[PDB]
Design a protein around this nucleic acid. Structure first.
Ligand SMILES: [Mg+2]
Ligand SMILES: [Mg+2]
Ligand SMILES: [Mg+2]
Ligand SMILES: [Mg+2]
Ligand SMILES: [Mg+2]
Ligand SMILES: [Mg+2]
Ligand SMILES: [Mg+2]
Ligand SMILES: [Mg+2]
Ligand SMILES: [Mg+2]
Ligand SMILES: [Mg+2]
Ligand SMILES: [Mg+2]
Ligand SMILES: [Mg+2]
Ligand SMILES: [Mg+2]
Ligand SMILES: [Mg+2]
Ligand SMILES: [Mg+2]
Ligand SMILES: [Mg+2]
Ligand SMILES: [Mg+2]
Ligand SMILES: [Mg+2]
Ligand SMILES: [Mg+2]
Ligand SMILES: [Mg+2]
Ligand SMILES: [Mg+2]
Ligand SMILES: [Mg+2]
Ligand SMILES: [Mg+2]
Ligand SMILES: [Mg+2]
Ligand SMILES: [Mg+2]
Ligand SMILES: [Mg+2]
Ligand SMILES: [Mg+2]
Ligand SMILES: [Mg+2]
Ligand SMILES: [Mg+2]
Ligand SMILES: [Mg+2]
Lengths: 205, 80, 122, 156, 129, 82
RNA sequence: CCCGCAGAAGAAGCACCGGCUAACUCCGUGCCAGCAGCCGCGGUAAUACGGAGGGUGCAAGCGUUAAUCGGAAUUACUGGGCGUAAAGCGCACGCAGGCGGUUUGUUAAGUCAGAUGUGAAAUCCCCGGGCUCAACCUGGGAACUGCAUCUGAUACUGGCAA
RNA sequence: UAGCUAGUAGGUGGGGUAACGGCUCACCUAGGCGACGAUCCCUAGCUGGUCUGAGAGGAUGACCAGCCACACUGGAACUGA
């Protein structure tokens, strides 16, 4: 299920920074971010239309940690749902519980947040939720249970999150170690470098 | 008010019985053309009053023979 | 073209026959090797391609290509055949399944092992 | 400001007394995104010269297209040598769903949401020309109201 | 033989617009006058005039805007070989509502938008774009 | 004869009964005349769980329809609670 | 289902990398061995045959075969054609059949509008609810493009009369 | 596959069925079906639905539900609502 290989390899192949590491050190210092991975990394082949569409889809999937079947189901639900298809797809991926935990700051990486969620450190409305793909609803309180409140990695992740740029659609209390999911993140709140048209076209072949 | 159909008398040779075409103007399922389709019915008529080529109003009834389950109600436009 | 003509006579769908009629809508079928031999390929290329005349369980006698380097097959050897033609071999429309009943996997293969019935090396 | 993309490069021959003389043809499309789109076709002995000639020709001979909020105003058909083309004003968010050359032409033109399909021949040169012609033969509500001597509210 | 006079009328309009003729004349009929009235109301023609007593001639005055024909395309839809009838919910929108569709309804010949507003269908005579 | 009974529906270990009037000879989940309610044995709190159309049930009983023991208990519960 | 114990401890594979099609180099072999869905590849520098390294795509699955629809507007009703690419009977007359210049009246068959009955439940779709999520289950609606009967409209088509 | 059909088509009367009826019998009439495809041959359980398709369509009828047919093969009745 989960990708268990080197993460900077994915970052180099994609080209951009996927935030696959905690971010204490520069990714340029941790790896040759410019060069592609492999024996023929220095060469930069010209990508075709299908190549760039596939590249964009892979970027989103690698960022969020979602395999093809689950991602395809997300697209199907987004297309079914009313409104803009790409915006709905991004909204669902944001709605994922592990993404929510990472955004609030109870995890250095999304993998670390997923680790906590799987190991039963997360309570949603006073209910211990175990699935990373759990869709968080608006006006949901998400809190760290007392068993995991003693973990030092949570505090370190909170400091890293304080370093990062804060999301407007969440309200997190670090002392209580709990955040409320105020609303679905708008497309303006989400990152601009991500392109949705390519994903929509690729899955609408 | 009772359900009834009008039609032309195709044949009246068998005694007390007539054949009544009830051609209907249906539309084709696929191509959308309106096609004239025909429905021959054996109709029971006492006194053998009907001739060929006339027009007759008929109603459904309990079966009177192997193929005869319709009865005449009134003859209209019986010119020759 | 005219709707009146179409009403009189509709359009009759062009029934496309299958190119592997011996399988009879089955994924694979069992047979007995009547003869094992080699044949010369068609014009632009050259080789000695290994083929088997096989009597199928449903009476049909077909010719089937033997993929991979080397084979242990011989006469009176039960094999499993699947669809797929070799193009530059006239009248050969079926492949033998390597790693099937009385058919050994290709020796010393490290890639496409699943296609050639080769078990994982340690 | 002008976004440009190369659709196809094709190798052609002349077959002269000595031997065969090869040369390259470049089909390009440029556009401003805001509605102006223009195609160019060039030819040279070498690929870079052909592409540059095509770019110059495409930069010239542009045409304005009436765009409604980044999409078409009504379903439009377009025809040429072999290419028969249909395009539909799809809703916002669907993206440009078109095949190859039509995708390139519409993307540089600036239409973000359409449902298109290319019937008949799909030869890149003819389909580009047919798509541009179809875009040209597309009037706006203001244009139809003016020509018919009515207000936009009467036309709706 | 002449089978459909309405198609002849539409063909005359189309050929006249193509040939840049100012007016087109044809043997007048009641249905033709109704269709001409709808066209004039929608503004695809400048005026119409029926002239004569025994065998009247309908004369339409074609309309031009900037050297191009106002009637870009005009297509017959219902025809003797294939009649077309639509219900009020299935009435088509010509050119996404910019063009008009002439529909003969129980309350006379009217445009598709007017028929939709009334809330009843009828026989779709022709599309005008 | 005509009777009001439960038809089992749902998933394994999570039954959900449809209260239906049907000819007794027909199969449990088979042909039925009318669906006059539902019963959820595993319904959680803040859920009605039971819903019986009492008017239709009374009409069928007047017509001469028998009632299974479980449906009778459900009717008793509904009338008692309401 | 919950609580406690221990220790990263017990848990990754398959296909592909010449173009179509995302992913390349070296070595072995020399029209042989072999590959192949199509185009093709191999005769001594093979990114296409085998091995290796690297990479790409899916993932407790991954490939191959069989089968249906799609792409195929390649049976074209929506939605094709017939001078030369396949396609106008050698030519005419003509029954059945298809189509019908113009005006008025009448009928209400086709057509349109409304209403009533029915179109089982499940399935599909919309708004919700319950399984920690999902699959799954479930409440209500919508839909079931239909058929029948009744009441109206009379522009067009049909019938009848002039 | 272009002609098919003598209980065949209709009528009168008796008999039979829980019930109408060539359902059966006697007599009388010479009809009935068919190019809007009768007859004959090959294949096939039907539907709600399923898959695919933008749609129209195309393919299909496993599981669930409704209906029909069959119970080693070919006949027959008895008991019984
Ligand atoms: Mg073609
Ligand atoms: Mg490539
Ligand atoms: Mg290979
Ligand atoms: Mg070499
Ligand atoms: Mg190789
Ligand atoms: Mg296949
Ligand atoms: Mg088709
Ligand atoms: Mg053609
Ligand atoms: Mg010739
Ligand atoms: Mg020819
Ligand atoms: Mg001739
Ligand atoms: Mg007339
Ligand atoms: Mg006539
Ligand atoms: Mg009527
Ligand atoms: Mg239903
Ligand atoms: Mg829920
Ligand atoms: Mg439901
Ligand atoms: Mg009339
Ligand atoms: Mg009349
Ligand atoms: Mg008798
Ligand atoms: Mg008697
Ligand atoms: Mg009978
Ligand atoms: Mg059978
Ligand atoms: Mg299609
Ligand atoms: Mg069928
Ligand atoms: Mg079975
Ligand atoms: Mg047996
Ligand atoms: Mg028996
Ligand atoms: Mg008994
Ligand atoms: Mg008895």
């Amino acid at each position: 299920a989960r990708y268990l290989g080197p993460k900077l390899k994915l970052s180099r192949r994609e080209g951009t920074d996927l935030f696959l590491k905690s971010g204490v050190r520069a990714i340029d210092t941790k790896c040759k971010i410019e060069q592609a991975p492999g024996q023929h990394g220095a060469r930069k082949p010209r990508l075709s239309d299908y190549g760039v569409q596939l590249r964009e889809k892979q970027k989103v999937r690698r960022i969020y940690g979602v395999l093809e079947r689950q991602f395809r189901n997300y697209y199907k639900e987004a297309a079914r749902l009313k409104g803009n298809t790409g915006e709905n797809l991004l909204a669902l991926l944001e709605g994922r519980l592990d993404n929510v935990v990472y955004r609030m700051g109870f995890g250095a990486t999304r993998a670390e947040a997923r680790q906590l969620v799987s190991h039963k450190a997360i309570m949603v409305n006073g209910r211990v939720v175990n699935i990373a793909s759990y869709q968080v609803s608006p006006n949901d309180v998400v809190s760290i249970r007392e068993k995991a409140k003693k973990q030092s990695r949570v505090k370190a992740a909170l400091e890293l999150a304080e370093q990062r740029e804060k999301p407007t659609w969440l309200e997190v209390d670090a002392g209580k170690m709990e955040g409320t999911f105020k609303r679905k993140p708008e497309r303006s709140d989400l990152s601009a470098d991500i392109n949705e048209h390519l994903i929509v076209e690729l899955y609408s072949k | 008010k009772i359900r009834t159909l009008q039609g032309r008398v195709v044949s009246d040779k068998m005694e007390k019985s007539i054949v009544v075409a009830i051609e209907r103007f249906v539309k084709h399922p696929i191509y959308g053309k309106f096609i004239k389709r025909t429905t021959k019915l054996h109709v029971h008529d006492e006194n053998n009053e009907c001739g060929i080529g006339d027009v007759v109003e008929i109603r459904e009834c309990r079966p009177l023979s192997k193929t005869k389950s319709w009865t005449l109600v009134r003859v209209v436009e019986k010119a020759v | 073209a005219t709707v009146n003509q179409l009403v009189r006579k509709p359009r009759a769908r062009k029934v496309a026959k299958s190119n592997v009629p011996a399988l009879e809508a089955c994924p694979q079928k069992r047979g007995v090797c009547t003869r094992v031999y080699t044949t010369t390929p068609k014009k632009p290329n050259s080789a000695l391609r290994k083929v088997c005349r096989v009597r199928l369980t449903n009476g049909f006698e077909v010719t089937s290509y033997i993929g991979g380097e080397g084979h242990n097959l011989q006469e009176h050897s039960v094999i499993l055949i699947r669809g797929g033609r070799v193009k530059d071999l006239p009248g050969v429309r079926y492949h033998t399944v390597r790693g099937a009943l009385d058919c050994s996997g290709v020796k010393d293969r490290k890639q496409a092992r699943s296609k050639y019935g080769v078990k994982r090396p340690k | 400001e002008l976004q440009e993309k190369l659709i196809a490069v094709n190798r052609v021959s002349k077959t002269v007394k000595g031997g065969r003389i090869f040369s390259f043809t470049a089909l390009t499309v440029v556009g401003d995104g805001n509605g102006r789109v223009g195609f160019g076709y060039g030819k040279a002995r070498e690929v870079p010269a052909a592409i540059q000639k095509a770019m110059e020709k495409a930069r010239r001979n542009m045409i304005n297209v009436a765009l409604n909020n980044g999409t078409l105003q009504h379903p439009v058909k377009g025809v040429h040598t072999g290419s028969r083309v249909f395009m539909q004003p799809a809703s916002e968010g669907t993206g440009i769903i078109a095949g190859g050359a039509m995708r390139a032409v519409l993307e540089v033109a600036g239409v973000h949401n359409v449902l298109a399909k290319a019937y008949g021949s799909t030869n890149p040169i003819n389909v580009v020309r047919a798509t541009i012609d179809g875009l040209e033969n597309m009037n706006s509500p203001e244009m139809v109201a003016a020509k018919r001597g009515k207000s936009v509210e009467e036309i709706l | 033989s002449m089978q459909d006079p309405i198609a002849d009328m539409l063909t005359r309009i189309r050929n006249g617009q193509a040939a840049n003729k100012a007016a087109v004349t044809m043997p007048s009929s009641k249905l033709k006058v109704a269709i001409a009235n709808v066209l004039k109301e929608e503004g695809f023609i400048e005026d119409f005039k029926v002239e004569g007593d025994t065998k009247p001639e309908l004369e339409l005055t074609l309309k031009y805007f900037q050297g191009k024909a106002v009637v870009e395309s005009i297509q017959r839809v219902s025809r003797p070989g294939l009649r077309i009838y639509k219900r009020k919910d299935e009435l088509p929108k010509v050119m996404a509502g910019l063009g008009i569709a002439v529909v003969s309804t129980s309350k006379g010949v009217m445009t598709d938008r007017a028929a939709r507003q009334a809330g009843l269908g009828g026989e779709i005579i022709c599309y005008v774009a | 004869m005509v009777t009001i009974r439960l038809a089992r529906h749902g998933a394994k270990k999570r039954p959900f009964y449809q209260v239906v009037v049907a000819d007794s000879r027909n199969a449990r989940n088979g042909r039925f005349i009318e669906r006059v309610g539902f019963f959820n044995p595993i319904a959680s709190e803040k859920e009605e769980g039971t819903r019986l159309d009492l008017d239709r049930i009374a009409h069928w009983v007047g017509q001469g329809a028998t009632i299974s023991d479980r449906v009778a208990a459900l009717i008793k519960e509904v009338n008692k609670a309401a």
